[PDB]
């Protein structure tokens, strides 16, 4: 059914997320996130949260 398919899709999406390289420079991360079209800061998130958001966005695309 669709439930197994979607949970497996999210499973390999997370697995891809764990295996994607993102630079540790905050400025470069900000520039990359701006290029991707998303706001740099999400309700005052921390830099680690910003890096995680960029990693997830890269994983989805």
């Amino acid at each position: 059914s669709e439930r197994q398919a979607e949970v497996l899709a999210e499973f390999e999406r997370r697995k891809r997320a764990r295996q994607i390289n993102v630079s540790t420079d905050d400025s470069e991360v900000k520039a990359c996130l701006r290029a991707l079209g998303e706001p740099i800061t999400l309700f005052g998130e921390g830099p680690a949260e910003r890096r995680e958001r960029l990693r997830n966005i890269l994983s989805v695309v």
Binding site: Q4, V7, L8, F11, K15, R18
Partner: protein, 224 residues
């Protein structure tokens, strides 16, 4: 340039990778993609894991636990054997064929031995030159053995330690330096009783200065 990492960072990276793999396996079990892991049973573990059922039919239980142990052991062995075949492969072509990076500079060591009448030492020197892929030549004359070896720095350091410590009338390096390109061909010997023939053979490749330095060293040894 490549950068190392401290032992603390090595331990943390290994621990993070192992924890990542364990979480991956556990969440794979969560989603049903993987069967729940079976208890690891050995001979000592037998009566603890399958105690209530080993009394039903002990020999079948013994067979099952031995099959599990052998399955783990054989799983470990396959990869090891395949990568040991990989060892043979590289050792004969990728783990022993280096050449010491001799591309921009050839270390040339020319030594002058006094007594080299034994063919066993010449055969061992030829085997050491062929095993280390070091070029050069050898000229024989009256109480003179001019052995020039041009190659890499590690091959020259091995040949100097073999000729100075592993081979025994005295052997001393007359000229140890660097050259732009190679001058001598394969490791061969040339017997020249006259000094003019050895000088012409050295000047055919442009290495008459080594023969002149060997003659000057012999004259200095015979004078004092």
């Amino acid at each position: 340039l490549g950068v190392y990492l401290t032992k603390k960072e090595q331990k943390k990276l290994r621990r993070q990778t192992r924890r990542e793999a364990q979480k991956e396996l556990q969440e794979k079990v969560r989603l049903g993609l993987m069967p729940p892991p079976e208890p690891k049973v050995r001979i000592s573990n037998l009566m603890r894991v399958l105690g209530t059922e080993a009394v039903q039919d002990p020999t079948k239980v013994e067979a099952h636990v031995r099959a599990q142990m052998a399955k783990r052991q054989k799983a470990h062995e396959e990869a090891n054997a395949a990568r040991k075949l990989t060892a043979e492969q590289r050792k004969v072509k990728k783990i022993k064929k280096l050449k010491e990076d001799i591309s921009q500079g050839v270390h040339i060591s020319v030594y002058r031995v006094r007594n080299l009448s034994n063919p066993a030492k010449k055969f061992k020197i030829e085997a050491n030159a062929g095993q280390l892929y070091l070029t050069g030549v050898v000229v024989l004359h009256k109480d003179v053995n001019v052995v020039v070896v041009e190659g890499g720095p590690k091959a020259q350091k091995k040949f100097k330690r073999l000729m100075l410590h592993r081979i025994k009338n005295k052997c001393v390096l007359v000229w140890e330096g660097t050259a732009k390109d190679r001058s001598f061909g394969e490791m061969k010997f040339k017997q020249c009783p006259t000094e003019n023939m050895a000088r012409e053979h050295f000047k055919k490749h442009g290495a008459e200065h080594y023969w002149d330095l060997a003659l000057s060293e012999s004259v200095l040894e015979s004078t004092d």
